[PDB]
Design a protein around this ligand. Structure first.
Ligand SMILES: [Mg+2]
Ligand SMILES: [Mg+2]
Ligand SMILES: [Mg+2]
Ligand SMILES: [Mg+2]
Ligand SMILES: [Mg+2]
Ligand SMILES: [Mg+2]
Ligand SMILES: [Mg+2]
Ligand SMILES: [Mg+2]
Ligand SMILES: [Mg+2]
Ligand SMILES: [Mg+2]
Ligand SMILES: [Mg+2]
Ligand SMILES: [Mg+2]
Ligand SMILES: [Mg+2]
Ligand SMILES: [Mg+2]
Ligand SMILES: [Mg+2]
Ligand SMILES: [Mg+2]
Ligand SMILES: [Mg+2]
Ligand SMILES: [Mg+2]
Ligand SMILES: [Mg+2]
Ligand SMILES: [Mg+2]
Ligand SMILES: [Mg+2]
Ligand SMILES: [Mg+2]
Ligand SMILES: [Mg+2]
Ligand SMILES: [Mg+2]
Ligand SMILES: [Mg+2]
Ligand SMILES: [Mg+2]
Ligand SMILES: [Mg+2]
Ligand SMILES: [Mg+2]
Ligand SMILES: [Mg+2]
Ligand SMILES: [Mg+2]
Ligand SMILES: [Mg+2]
Ligand SMILES: [Mg+2]
Ligand SMILES: [Mg+2]
Ligand SMILES: [Mg+2]
Ligand SMILES: [Mg+2]
Ligand SMILES: [Mg+2]
Ligand SMILES: [Mg+2]
Ligand SMILES: [Mg+2]
Ligand SMILES: [Mg+2]
Ligand SMILES: [Mg+2]
Ligand SMILES: [Mg+2]
Ligand SMILES: [Mg+2]
Ligand SMILES: [Mg+2]
Ligand SMILES: [Mg+2]
Ligand SMILES: [Mg+2]
Ligand SMILES: [Mg+2]
Ligand SMILES: [Mg+2]
Ligand SMILES: [Mg+2]
Ligand SMILES: [Mg+2]
Ligand SMILES: [Mg+2]
Ligand SMILES: [Mg+2]
Ligand SMILES: [Mg+2]
Ligand SMILES: [Mg+2]
Ligand SMILES: [Mg+2]
Ligand SMILES: [Mg+2]
Ligand SMILES: [Mg+2]
Ligand SMILES: [Mg+2]
Ligand SMILES: [Mg+2]
Ligand SMILES: [Mg+2]
Ligand SMILES: [Mg+2]
Ligand SMILES: [Mg+2]
Ligand SMILES: [Mg+2]
Ligand SMILES: [Mg+2]
Ligand SMILES: [Mg+2]
Ligand SMILES: [Mg+2]
Ligand SMILES: [Mg+2]
Ligand SMILES: [Mg+2]
Ligand SMILES: [Mg+2]
Ligand SMILES: [Mg+2]
Ligand SMILES: [Mg+2]
Ligand SMILES: [Mg+2]
Ligand SMILES: [Mg+2]
Ligand SMILES: [Mg+2]
Ligand SMILES: [Mg+2]
Ligand SMILES: [Mg+2]
Ligand SMILES: [Mg+2]
Ligand SMILES: [Mg+2]
Lengths: 136, 59, 78, 386
RNA sequence: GUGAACAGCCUCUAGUUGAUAGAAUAAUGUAGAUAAGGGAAGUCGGCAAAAUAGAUCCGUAACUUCGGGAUAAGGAUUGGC
RNA sequence: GCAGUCAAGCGUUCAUAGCGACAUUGCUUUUUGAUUCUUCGAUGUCGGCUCUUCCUAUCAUACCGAAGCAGAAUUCGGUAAGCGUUGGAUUGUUCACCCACUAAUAGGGAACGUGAGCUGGGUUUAGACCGUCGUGAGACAGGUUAGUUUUACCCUACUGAUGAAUGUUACCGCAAUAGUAAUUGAACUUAGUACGAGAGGAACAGUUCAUUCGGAUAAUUGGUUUUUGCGGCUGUCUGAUCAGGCAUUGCCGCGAAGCUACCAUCCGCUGGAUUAUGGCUGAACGCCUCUAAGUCAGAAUCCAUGCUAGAACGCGGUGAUUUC
C-alpha cells in the first residue's frame, strides 16, 4: 500500500504470493497482471511476499497490448479468491483474482473497472472508488 | 426513498421490469416498461417510513 | 444484527456463521455451512435436494395451517 | 563460517524447560500490589473452563474504521460457582524471603476439601482435621492466639479457599484448594475478614466486574512427546532427505563440542504452566438467572449453555466469567482468574462493552438454532411430536 | 462373469489358511493417501508427485526420404430402462 | 584488509567542517604467500540447504555530540551487538551481476561451523566425444556427457522422562540459582505549520492500523476422514427379494469428534539504576572551567517488576499418623 493509501487497511488474509497472475480488470489494454512484489511487505527467510485485497503490488503484464508489456508498473488488487474475514465476522471470497494498473500515487490508468470490487479496497484508494460499479 | 411493493417478498431491494397498471411505475409511453429498483415488502430496520392503516381503534 | 438465510438451502445464517460468495456478475451468495456451498459449487439444484426450504415449498410439505382461514376484516360505516 | 542468511531463532527461551508442569493447577506467582485503603476482597478466583462461543457487540473506538459498528468476537466461558473460605495463612518477611508463619483452619471442612487431602478416599477412615476441630471445643484459646499470632506479625495474609466442584458437571468429586492474597486494608482487618468467613461462601462478583482486565493462570493442554518441527516451529527438511525430515539438520557446530541448551530437540509438548494477561470480562453471569444468555437487545429467555450442552463439559448452572477470546488451558480444567497487576489505560481497556447477542447454537455440529423454540418454529412439527 | 483380451478385479473345481504372540497407538520412520489461496517463486535440474488415458464421432500444423509426422494439437459423447 | 601521527595541499576565503601528499607508527588473521610442527596401519575436499551460538571494524533501530546543519535530505563522531538484516533471473558455484521489496537488505568467526545431518550440481577413478599436443601408449589449472554418498543399540552432551535414601504420608507454600522477549514500519492529526526569496518542507503529544518475533487457543472459517456415520456407483459372488461379502481402506458426494492454519482467533507487564552526552555547584589557578570533592538530567544498555523451571543432598506452614 504505502503511497496514496488514504486510510489504514485492517489485516486481510493473504491470497496472492509473488508469481500469481490475476485478471486485469480495467480498460487499459492489459488482460492479466503478474505479481512481482508486494509493497510494504517484510522479510522472513524463504517467505514469499503475498498480496491481499487492497494491496499495491509491482507487476508486469503478461497478456496485453504490446506497449503495455515487458515493463514493470504498479497495480492494486481489487478481488481475491482466497477467503478472508472481516471484522463484522464474515468469511467472504470473490470468484477470481484481479487488480488494476495504477501509478505510484494510486491513480488509475484506465477509465473503468470491469468487475465487482472489495470495499476494503474501495475505501483505501479514491480513484478506485470512482471507477467502480458494484462494491462488495 | 425506494417504495415497497405488495407481495414481492424478501426485505431487500431488487430491480424489476414493471408494466402499466402496476405500483411504483407510471409509464411515459404506450407499451413503455422500465427496469427500476424496488424495496421489498417485508419490514426491516432500513425503512425510513412505515405506512399503516388503522383497522380497529383502541382505548 | 441481521440473520441471513442460505441462498441454497434456506437455513438461517446467524452472525459469523457460514461463508459468503461474490459471483463474477456481482450476485452475492450466502451459505450457512460447507455443505450447501459444496452442492452449490456442484451445480446441484435446490429444488431437487429434498431437505431444502425451496424443495419443501415446491413439493408442498407441511404448510398445513398457513392456507387456513382467518379473521382480519374491518367495520366503519362513516 | 556464518549463517549466510539471517533469520530469527525458533521459540522463546523464557519458557524453558518445556517439561510437564508440577501440577494441574498452575501457580499464582504474583499478586496485585496491596492498597490497604480499600475494603478487603479476594484477588483471584477458581473455576473451570467450560467452552467458547461467539459474541456480537457494537464497537466503541473513536478513530477505528469499525467505530460505532457491530463486531463479532470469540469468548471463553469459565464456570465459577462460589468459592468457600476455610483458612488463613500469614506470611512474614525474612532476609531469606517470605515464609509462612501459621495456618489457621475453619472448624468444619466439607468432604469436598477433605477429599483433597487423600489419595484413597473410599478406604480411608477420613480422620483428617478431626483433632484440629477439637481446638474449637475449648473456650477456643488456641485458635485465637493463632489468629492473634498472625496480627502481631505477618506482612501479608492469604485466604485458603476451595471450589464447590459438586456444583459442576464434572465427575471429579475432589475439590480444589488454594491460597488467595487478601489485598484490602489493615493486616488486622484482613484476618478479621478471614476469621469471619470461615465456612462462609464468597462470590465472583465480589472480586470481578464487567469490562475489567483480568489475567488467567492455567496449565496448558498436553500433547505428549513432540518432534522438533511442531514443538519448536522448525522448518521441514527437504523431501529428498535420508533418514527423516521433521528434524534439525545441524544440531550444532563442531566447537563447542557439546549440543547446546539453545537448540531445538524433540521433547514434551503441552502441559506447561502459563500466565496469560489482559482478558477483558465481557459478562459476569449469575447462576440463578434464567436468561443468562439473554441481552438487553436479544431478550429471549435462555442461558449460555448451548444446544446439547457445552461439548465435552456439560451444562453450566452456576455463575460464570465470560472473557474476551481464549484462555490457556482446556475444557474441564481448573483455572485461576487473577486481578491485573497494573492499571491499564490503553483506551482498549476501559471500553465499557455491552453485549448485543451471545451465540447459543450447538457446538457438537453445524449449529443452526439458538433454542428448541427457534428449532420448532422453523422445522414445524415432526413425526415424533404430539 | 465383466472386458478387445491368457490384462486387472470377483467366482467353481483343486489347494491353502504356512510367515512368533499379546497390549498400546509418543517421537522419528517405511509403504499408502488428502489439503484452502497461489502455482516451480522450491531445486543444479520439475527430482518426487499431480495431470492425461478406453471407445465412438468431429477435427488435425511445420516439415518430409511422400512411406510419414499423427492418438499431432483440439474438441463432443458414454449410465439405466 | 583496517586504523593512526606530522601537516604541504584540497576545500570561493579558510591546513585539521569533510578530505589529505611526502614521509612515518601500527593493528588484524574471512586475502595470498612464506614455513613444514601435527595427521599418509585415512581427522571425508567445493558450494547449497538447515540450525545454533559468538565477534564488532554498526547497515537498520534507541539516545547523543559535530558540520561549509536555514528547512528537508545528508555527511563526521560517541554510548551501543538489545533487535533485525529479505524475495527473485543467470551460474555447481563461494564470488560476481541485474530485478524487486525494505527501517536496513552490515562485515566476520565457530576444524575456511555444520556429509553415521541432507543434497551430490562442481571437483576428482573406471565408459565416452571434441579441441590442442604426441610416431605411439597416452597427456591437457581445455571444453563435454554418464557415473553405489555405509553403521549408533555404547559413552558423554543435549532434549524430555522415572527415581532409593535423611520417621511415614498428605495438603498448602517460600525462593537460592538458572533462563527471560519483544520488534520494526505506516497513515490520520500536528501541518502545507515551524525554516525558507522561492522551490520546497519536518518533529514531540494524541489517534488508527501494520510488519517481524513469541505464548496460547479451536466460538467461527478452512484442511484432514476408518465415525468406514449416511447416501450414491462399477464389477462379481450369496437362486431372486431383503440384506450383504470380496476388489492391499474398491470408487464418489456429504461428513460430525479430534487434531489443526497469519488459511483461523485471543494475549505479549512497569519500576529503578546507568552509558554517551548536556548540565548544577565548585576549587586547583583571586580569573576561568561539568570534576578534582559533591551533584542534576539521561539510551533499543543494565538490575529489578513480571514470566518459566524449582536445588531430585536449599527451606517454611499444615493435616493425619497402624496395636495381634
Ligand atoms: Mg501488507
Ligand atoms: Mg531459500
Ligand atoms: Mg472516470
Ligand atoms: Mg469441514
Ligand atoms: Mg471441505
Ligand atoms: Mg550475519
Ligand atoms: Mg508455629
Ligand atoms: Mg504430530
Ligand atoms: Mg501454533
Ligand atoms: Mg537419498
Ligand atoms: Mg530445520
Ligand atoms: Mg519372518
Ligand atoms: Mg506377513
Ligand atoms: Mg509418519
Ligand atoms: Mg477430495
Ligand atoms: Mg493446494
Ligand atoms: Mg494454472
Ligand atoms: Mg528458479
Ligand atoms: Mg511459468
Ligand atoms: Mg533460489
Ligand atoms: Mg544442470
Ligand atoms: Mg542454476
Ligand atoms: Mg516442467
Ligand atoms: Mg518424474
Ligand atoms: Mg485433483
Ligand atoms: Mg509433434
Ligand atoms: Mg443416452
Ligand atoms: Mg609536511
Ligand atoms: Mg575554516
Ligand atoms: Mg591555503
Ligand atoms: Mg579479509
Ligand atoms: Mg612434518
Ligand atoms: Mg601443512
Ligand atoms: Mg588427513
Ligand atoms: Mg594422512
Ligand atoms: Mg589415524
Ligand atoms: Mg575415520
Ligand atoms: Mg570426524
Ligand atoms: Mg562555516
Ligand atoms: Mg557523543
Ligand atoms: Mg544479540
Ligand atoms: Mg554478549
Ligand atoms: Mg535469493
Ligand atoms: Mg538461482
Ligand atoms: Mg554483464
Ligand atoms: Mg543479495
Ligand atoms: Mg580461518
Ligand atoms: Mg568446513
Ligand atoms: Mg558431523
Ligand atoms: Mg554421508
Ligand atoms: Mg559428481
Ligand atoms: Mg550438468
Ligand atoms: Mg571418466
Ligand atoms: Mg599425469
Ligand atoms: Mg559430470
Ligand atoms: Mg545414467
Ligand atoms: Mg552401537
Ligand atoms: Mg538409526
Ligand atoms: Mg493537510
Ligand atoms: Mg534561502
Ligand atoms: Mg524478530
Ligand atoms: Mg473439522
Ligand atoms: Mg457405502
Ligand atoms: Mg448393480
Ligand atoms: Mg421389492
Ligand atoms: Mg488380489
Ligand atoms: Mg503468530
Ligand atoms: Mg510479562
Ligand atoms: Mg536498582
Ligand atoms: Mg556553570
Ligand atoms: Mg558526567
Ligand atoms: Mg567523576
Ligand atoms: Mg581537574
Ligand atoms: Mg527492552
Ligand atoms: Mg508489574
Ligand atoms: Mg526439591
Ligand atoms: Mg517440605
Amino acid at each position: 500500500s504505502g503511497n496514496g493509501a488514504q486510510g489504514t487497511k485492517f489485516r486481510i488474509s493473504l491470497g496472492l504470493p509473488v508469481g500469481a497472475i490475476m485478471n486485469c480488470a480495467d480498460n487499459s489494454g492489459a488482460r492479466n497482471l503478474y505479481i512481482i512484489a508486494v509493497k510494504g511487505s517484510g522479510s522472513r527467510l524463504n517467505r514469499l511476499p503475498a498480496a491481499s485485497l487492497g494491496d499495491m503490488v509491482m507487476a508486469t503484464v503478461k497478456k496485453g497490448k504490446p506497449e503495455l508489456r515487458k515493463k514493470v508498473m504498479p497495480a492494486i488488487v481489487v478481488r481475491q479468491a482466497k477467503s478472508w474475514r472481516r471484522r463484522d465476522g464474515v468469511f467472504l471470497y470473490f470468484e477470481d483474482n484481479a487488480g488494476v494498473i495504477a501509478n505510484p500515487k494510486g491513480e488509475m490508468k484506465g477509465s473503468a473497472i470491469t468487475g465487482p470490487v472489495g470495499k476494503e479496497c474501495a475505501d483505501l484508494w479514491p480513484r478506485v472508488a470512482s471507477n467502480s460499479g458494484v462494491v462488495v | 426513498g425506494f417504495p415497497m411493493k405488495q407481495g414481492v417478498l424478501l426485505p431487500t431491494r431488487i430491480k424489476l421490469l414493471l408494466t402499466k397498471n402496476v405500483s411504483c411505475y407510471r409509464p411515459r409511453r404506450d407499451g413503455e416498461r422500465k427496469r427500476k429498483s424496488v424495496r421489498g415488502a417485508i419490514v426491516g430496520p432500513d425503512l425510513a417510513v412505515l405506512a399503516l392503516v388503522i383497522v380497529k381503534k383502541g382505548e | 444484527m441481521k440473520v441471513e438465510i442460505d441462498s441454497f438451502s434456506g437455513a438461517k445464517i446467524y452472525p459469523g456463521r457460514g461463508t459468503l460468495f461474490v459471483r463474477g456478475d456481482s450476485k452475492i451468495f450466502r451459505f450457512q455451512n460447507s455443505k450447501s456451498a459444496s452442492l452449490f459449487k456442484q451445480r446441484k439444484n435446490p429444488r431437487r435436494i429434498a431437505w431444502t426450504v425451496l424443495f419443501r415449498k415446491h413439493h408442498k410439505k407441511g404448510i398445513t395451517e398457513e392456507v387456513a382461514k382467518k379473521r382480519s376484516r374491518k367495520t366503519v360505516k362513516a | 563460517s556464518h549463517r549466510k542468511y539471517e533469520a530469527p531463532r525458533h521459540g522463546h527461551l523464557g519458557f524453558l524447560p518445556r517439561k510437564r508442569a508440577a501440577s494441574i493447577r498452575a501457580r499464582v506467582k504474583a499478586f496485585p500490589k496491596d492498597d490497604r485503603s480499600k475494603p478487603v476482597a479476594l484477588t483471584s478466583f477458581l473455576g473451570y473452563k467450560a467452552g467458547m462461543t461467539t459474541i456480537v457487540r457494537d464497537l466503541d473506538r473513536p478513530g477505528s474504521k469499525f467505530h460505532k459498528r457491530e463486531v463479532v468476537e470469540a469468548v471463553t466461558v469459565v464456570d465459577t460457582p462460589p468459592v468457600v473460605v476455610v483458612g488463613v495463612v500469614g506470611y512474614v518477611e525474612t532476609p531469606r524471603g517470605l515464609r509462612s508463619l501459621t495456618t489457621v483452619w475453619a472448624e468444619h471442612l466439607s468432604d469436598e476439601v477433605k477429599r483433597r487431602f487423600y489419595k484413597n478416599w473410599y478406604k480411608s477412615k477420613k480422620k483428617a482435621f478431626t483433632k484440629y476441630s477439637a481446638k474449637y471445643a475449648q473456650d477456643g484459646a488456641g485458635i485465637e492466639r493463632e489468629l492473634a499470632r498472625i496480627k502481631k506479625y505477618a506482612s501479608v495474609v492469604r485466604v485458603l479457599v476451595h471450589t464447590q466442584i459438586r456444583k459442576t458437571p464434572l465427575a471429579q468429586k475432589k475439590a480444589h484448594l488454594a491460597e488467595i492474597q487478601l489485598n484490602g486494608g489493615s493486616i488486622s482487618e484482613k484476618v478479621d475478614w478471614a476469621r469471619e468467613h470461615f465456612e462462609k461462601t464468597v462470590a465472583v462478583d465480589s472480586v470481578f466486574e464487567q469490562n475489567e482486565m483480568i489475567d488467567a493462570i492455567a496449565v496448558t493442554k498436553g500433547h505428549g512427546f513432540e518432534g522438533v518441527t511442531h514443538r519448536w516451529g522448525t522448518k521441514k527438511l527437504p523431501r529428498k532427505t535420508h533418514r527423516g525430515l521433521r528434524k534439525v539438520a545441524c544440531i550444532g557446530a563442531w566447537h563447542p563440542a557439546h549440543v547446546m541448551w539453545s537448540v531445538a530437540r524433540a521433547g514434551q509438548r503441552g502441559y506447561h504452566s502459563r500466565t496469560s494477561i489482559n482478558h477483558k470480562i465481557y459478562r459476569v453471569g449469575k447462576g440463578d438467572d434464567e436468561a443468562n444468555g439473554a441481552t438487553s437487545f436479544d431478550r429471549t429467555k435462555k442461558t449460555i449453555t448451548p444446544m446439547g450442552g457445552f461439548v465435552h463439559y456439560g451444562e453450566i448452572k452456576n455463575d460464570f466469567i465470560m472473557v474476551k477470546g481464549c484462555i490457556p488451558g482446556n475444557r474441564k480444567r481448573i483455572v485461576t482468574l487473577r486481578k491485573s497487576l497494573y492499571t491499564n489505560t490503553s483506551r482498549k481497556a476501559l471500553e465499557e462493552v455491552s453485549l448485543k447477542w451471545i451465540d447459543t447454537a450447538s457446538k457438537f455440529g453445524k449449529g443452526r438454532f439458538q433454542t428448541p423454540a427457534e428449532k420448532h418454529a422453523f422445522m414445524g412439527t415432526l413425526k415424533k411430536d404430539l
